[PDB]
Amino acid sequence: SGVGHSTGNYNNRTEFYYHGDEVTIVCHSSRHIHLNMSESEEYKIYDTDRGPRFPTDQTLQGRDTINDSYHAQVETPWFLINPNSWGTWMNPADFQQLTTTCREVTLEHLDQTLDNIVIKTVSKQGSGAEETTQYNNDLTALLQVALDKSNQLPWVADNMYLDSLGYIPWRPCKLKQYSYHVNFWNTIDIISGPQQNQWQQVKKEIRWDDLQFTPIETTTEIDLLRTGDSWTSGPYKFNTKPTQLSYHWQSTRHTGSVHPTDPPNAIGQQGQNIRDINGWQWGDRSDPMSAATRVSNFHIGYSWPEWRIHYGSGGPAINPGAPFSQAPWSTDPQVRLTQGASEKAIFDYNHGDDDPAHRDQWWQNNLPITGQTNWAPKNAHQANLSSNVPSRQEFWTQDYHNTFGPFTAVDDVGIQYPWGAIWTKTPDTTHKPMMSAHAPFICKDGPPGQLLVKLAPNYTENLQTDGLGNNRIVTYATFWWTGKLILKGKLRLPRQFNLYNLPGRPRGTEAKKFLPNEIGHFELPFMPGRCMPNYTM
Amino acid sequence: SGVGHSTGNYNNRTEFYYHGDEVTIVCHSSRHIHLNMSESEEYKIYDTDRGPRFPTDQTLQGRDTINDSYHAQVETPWFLINPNSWGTWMNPADFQQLTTTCREVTLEHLDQTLDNIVIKTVSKQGSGAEETTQYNNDLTALLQVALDKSNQLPWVADNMYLDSLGYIPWRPCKLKQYSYHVNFWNTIDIISGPQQNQWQQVKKEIRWDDLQFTPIETTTEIDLLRTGDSWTSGPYKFNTKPTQLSYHWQSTRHTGSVHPTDPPNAIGQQGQNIRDINGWQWGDRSDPMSAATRVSNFHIGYSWPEWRIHYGSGGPAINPGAPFSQAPWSTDPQVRLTQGASEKAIFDYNHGDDDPAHRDQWWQNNLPITGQTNWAPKNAHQANLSSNVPSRQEFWTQDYHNTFGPFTAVDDVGIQYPWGAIWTKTPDTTHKPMMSAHAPFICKDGPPGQLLVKLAPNYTENLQTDGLGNNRIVTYATFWWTGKLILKGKLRLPRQFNLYNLPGRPRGTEAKKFLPNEIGHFELPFMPGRCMPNYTM
């Protein structure tokens, strides 16, 4: 190109192609990215404060230790571009088209580019209120671009902390610095002290002798780009497995053969369960034949120590448990039952909040997903199962056992449209996780490579080793990210006689939200991604 | 054919073909099926009573809520033919031949037909004790036949409720109507009230806005058959995995290298465990070297909250746990220990009971399967494992934890000959069950399609919309189902020097049972299907 030729165009429109039972979705996305000169040109390793609302005393007996943010990390001068959110890609009407017409979807491949690089230096004349800023584009300045296609850098592209390209095509995007954890010990003893009601710090430190420090420079090759230059990543092919776009309402009581019933006679009458019937029960039960004790081949859902806080080497964390809905147990609407492994997105103006300077939030309670719902305290167990009822003993109620086992069938959450991550890195361990607690797609052979960008340091006349920022000219860049990810769906067709409830906005919400304001402010709606019902087995 | 030509024959004999280490079993089966005019020509959706022996009060503190039969369902006018039981296929001597000569077996493919359709209308003349019935065959009447080869209907072909073609070749079979569950909430709180000793209904209702209604007519294509007509399903090919025809007696103490022992000298003496030996223990143990604390690679069996009652969206159900034998713990014969995930078949005259008007029962306690036996209260855990014994603390006994994990190896029940189901539908969920609590074969790509039959309604002169059965002529049909399923076994050969105990009748039983009576009444014997012992590892 040159100084005066643009190196790319803008395509943010998505494509749907229906042939047979297959549906190809080509999602185009384009962003205008504002980049600033790095705060420091150096890599920094440091630990942090314990975080806000962490206990300084034992008044709460240490139940507040779940508010630990403590950690250690390497501060990279680079910046991360991840398009790892749904909604960086599709608009609300495009995701509605996806989930109405597709029963499941996969990731096919990903492309992305960077072009129309503009680098400006900001100069100031005069002083005081007479100070005048001038923005001069530096035509010979460089932008540094690193993509690790070999996945040799630590992966932090999880959309957690919602650091991702924004969801609204016409607004500018602003990157966050690339940073990763180093080895540290944070171990908190909540059993400490007499009566074992006190919490105590055991070890909180950076672990230096075991630590790993990988810079971007010695790891991946870096492209240096002027104004007339562009960058393409090349094709990336996913290998994942499809995600279900429907939700399952069947429990193990909704599942198999139906208990023999005598039909009702008139419009007010109910069916009657037949008393003497033949079939397979579990224990010695031969007379009750309760549909409850009917033997089944599998079991849908499992119990857990809901809100399991694992106090590990790095600190307390949550061990999630299975997703489901508390709607069958809900009763009072005011009380909010979080125990279905619910999640909550806290988001901002670029990520689909209408208000600048304040953040909005969405608690996904997973209401459509029932039949998987297992509240651990509601369960029980008996010593024996037979024609006799056990006594006060022989019967236990509130336990909180993990009942995951070889016979259980569960679901995952699925796509969570605006704020949910798309793919995920697979942990490199002897036993790889069977499924993911958040991201619908697990990458079997390496996640899409991380695109890291940096402005090359632009130095003044004098260069002093003692100097940091006083030594470089104040600089910023704006450029354009474009990307294309392609999806493969499977055509959804009616499986029932009656009308479906088709995808749409969340229940209590209206449509004046989600539409631009007099100032241009609007939100993106939550789209479940498991949308319409389907049979399990 | 025509009115006066028969459209098929009767083949109920089974074939064994031995070539090399492979053995092909071709099971032929033929049934004479009696069908009646549907009670109603319409689809009905209704819920039921809570069931017999369900509590109307809190006297039992709500431990009787396991007797819940409540549910909701769509009443289809159609009728189900499922040959999904073992024993619809093989007679006792044919299944003995299978389990003696085969170490494992698979399902190969299935064929089935319907032919020799006979439809009669029953007319009555006179009134009172002079009333005379006449049975006239209606040559132009139709039989409706629907097979869903695409598995688009809810699957209820689980042989639970023993609704399946009968086990005795020369007796007539009688179908049950096809029915399936709809979406309903049944949630029972057994924690309710002060002291948390009371039970309460939370939500019991049909869930109408989320409900799915699929008729047979809008789903699958229906064949209309006269007398001279027949129906073949076409070939169905299973893809499953083999089932083990042997039982495993080895626990993790029966498994690996043997503790070093000094042999006995004379006929009364025992071996002595050598005191100072070298090897891998678990904790700091270096001196005891107890075979108990020898490290092993795996563990055989797992604990569970035996008789786990999961109170889910549809109601309470049992979360099974692993099958095993209580025989090592049995002691007193009178007490019946159900905790090995035992099952009980309640069956009737056509399904292998000798007495009409009464039902017999068989409690399968799984006695041969040991080494998998884990009674959860009998276990323990310690804080540390070392050359020292822990104190009163540091040692816990009755826990009921699920100990299934990454190192565990377990079995399933296997074939349960007369009353057990053969195959099963795989639940459509993110995590598919690792194995099945009952049916030995899991269908990876769709279960054999369900054959639904119906008599077309035969109407009188006048047709009134207000009329139901007063509008159609009283009609019934008899026809002949034939089917062929083929099995692939692997030849069993002696692995030991000493004599085996070969398959036969259950232990306490005699042979005057299982043989016809002066009236022709006899039972079919339970055949374990895991019959002879084998080594695990």
Place this chain on the structure above:
Amino acid sequence: SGVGHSTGNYNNRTEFYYHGDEVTIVCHSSRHIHLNMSESEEYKIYDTDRGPRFPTDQTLQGRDTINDSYHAQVETPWFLINPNSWGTWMNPADFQQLTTTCREVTLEHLDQTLDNIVIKTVSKQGSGAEETTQYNNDLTALLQVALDKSNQLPWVADNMYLDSLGYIPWRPCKLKQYSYHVNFWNTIDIISGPQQNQWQQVKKEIRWDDLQFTPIETTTEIDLLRTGDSWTSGPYKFNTKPTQLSYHWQSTRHTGSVHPTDPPNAIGQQGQNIRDINGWQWGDRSDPMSAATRVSNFHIGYSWPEWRIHYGSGGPAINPGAPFSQAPWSTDPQVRLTQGASEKAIFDYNHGDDDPAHRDQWWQNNLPITGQTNWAPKNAHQANLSSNVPSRQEFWTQDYHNTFGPFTAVDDVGIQYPWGAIWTKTPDTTHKPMMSAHAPFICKDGPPGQLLVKLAPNYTENLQTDGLGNNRIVTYATFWWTGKLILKGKLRLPRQFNLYNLPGRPRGTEAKKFLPNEIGHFELPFMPGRCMPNYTM
């Protein structure tokens, strides 16, 4: 075939095929039809009573003369099978699939058959309460089948009077006799008498000298069918034009360039219309430049003498006017404004009512269709249009003029799912109608031929010319109609950023309707067929 072979099968399932922007919908439908012996074997010509609720006096000044049912007709012994309703074809979930995924649809071709003919004679023995009916199938009896593929018979297949094959696949259908109007004069003078407030009959008579009588026998060839016989119509190809599956919200004030506006500043402020602007107005207006008087190229909608009663040769009728919504004018919900050329379906158990012995009704007020809404009394006209406002004179308000003209653009109603007709006969006149007030498809070259059926008369031993029904044996038939119509849609894709409101049940309704009952009773929902919004110009 023969007596004992069935001549066809049952396929009621619908198919969707998506390739590119084209979508083929193959609708299969199958009905079980109950036919009775004709009331008379002869053609009858007669006139009727004036009808219920017609005035016998002048108390209402003759405004009740709109309740005239009077007419004359030829009574044919034959019976009509018309599948001319939407909903004879698709179920609610299949029509939802159509209107979500298609922006417009055409009719492609139609096939239909008749098979599995069963003819029974009913005999009675004894007398009194001892009387015994016997139903004997007469194997040599005939069914008469006439299809006029040349459209030489009068066409009465308009689904008006909802005489059409039923909407529920599993219920029996019952035909109505074929009948058509003859030439009669009915002329009512509502101007009669002094003060012109009285109504009077002018001429009410059958017009015999001009009358036309066409039997089925001398017109079309008739097929005679035994039990082992079937009938296929052959292919019929439609030539029609597509119907729009979207509704238009734009009026002529929603349409073109927008009035110049000064945008709002903060969240509560509104835009301000700019005062001095340049553009094309209508009259001498140069200063006001009201968006109202902006010249436009076309005009959307037209006024009418709403509820125009044309007193013609055959009697009073309604001259419809354009369809639109009264929702912008609605205000009070209790008052029901009918003036948008609304329609009302009155239907019964087979046609989608849940209650037998009572009828339900649906008033289609066409609420989504706005921008076409022209209430004639709300309009006005002025003498001159200029910078001056006219006086009390020069301005007229309540007029009721027909404002249809050369610049107007209007819509039609579109598909009305359960009860609406599909196609229509084109009147043979010098000026053919531009569009249709009800049926979405006008047949340019002949409507699908009418299928007329009749049982051949089955006579007793003696045949007397004086005898009518006393001469023929009491007979009825049941048989099976199958048909296939194929549609061509155009793929609907998102035209907007925000979420659509997707097709579903009518607003105030719940889903416990539309789903089967404990007795099996349910309704079919109204599906608009103009479902989602779209831009006009």
